[PDB]
């Protein structure tokens with residue numbers, strides 16, 4: 001998001017590339033919240049073995 | 051007066067004694083380095 | 099003074115508010131001269147830095163606050179989250195300073211960066227203190243989002 005904006009001038013509105021990067025950031029952050037909920041609902045701390 | 055090989059020439063010189071301001075560097079180099087060396091001392095309290 | 103359409107103007111982050119013309123007599127070594135001045139009132143628009151440094155840093159310090167939802171026995175996970183947050187807070191402090199010139203005094207953007215940095219550093223030392231105690235997580239689970247929420251009401255009202 002930083003290295004995509006510097007090719008543009010310092011305009012005061014959001015372009016379509018910014019609206020792509022924002023939604024992609026929302027999905028990545030939602031994957032983080034997904035892991036947060038999964039880790040909160042984790043009981044035993046070991047894993048599994050054959 | 052300065053002296054060259056062609057003769058002696060008059061000279062005026064205007065000079066300034068600039069002093070650098072410490073405030074920018076003390077928050078963008080010195081303080082990050084101090085806090086980063088603070089962060090390394092967190093390791094000494096963690097279990098081995 | 100005749101301005102134009104005020105839209106072909108390449109003023110991007112600013113916006114011409116108005117103009118005022120004045121005249122005065124200055125005194126120099128040679129003599130007194132009539133000086134004519136035109137003042138151009140320009141007011142800035144932050145929409146650019148919101149996506150440059152504000153939102154970006156706010157989402158990093160939101161990612162700082164999810165460490166509390168991770169269990170206390172997962173030590174390398176939470177310390178990896180901590181070290182990544184603090185190194186990227188330093189990185190975003192460095193990057194946002196490139197747009198600013200080399201001035202000595204502090205700005206409101208630098209004050210926001212410093213408040214976010216001390217917030218994430220407080221989060222890391224709180225997790226560290228919890229780890230040394232078990233060898234208050236829920237207590238922070240409310241306090242650390244709320245302290246930034248009251249800060250943003252303090253920060254934006256006082257500067258706007």
Ligand SMILES: *[C@@H]1O[C@H](CO)[C@@H](O[C@@H]2O[C@H](CO)[C@@H](O[C@@H]3O[C@H](CO)[C@@H](O)[C@H](O)[C@@H]3O)[C@H](O)[C@H]2NC(C)=O)[C@H](O)[C@H]1NC(C)=O
Nearest residue numbers: 051052053054059060061062063064065066067068069070
């Ligand atoms: C910045 O640097 C310059 C150059 O180093 C400094 O200029 C120097 O100033 C001193 C005194 O102001 C000069 O000394 C003079 O020497 C003559 C010799 O006959 C003497 O008659 C005078 O009474 C005086 O003592 C020195 O010559 C001069 N350097 C040069 C190369 O001309 C300057 O002071 C420094 N600081 C500032 C704030 O500019």
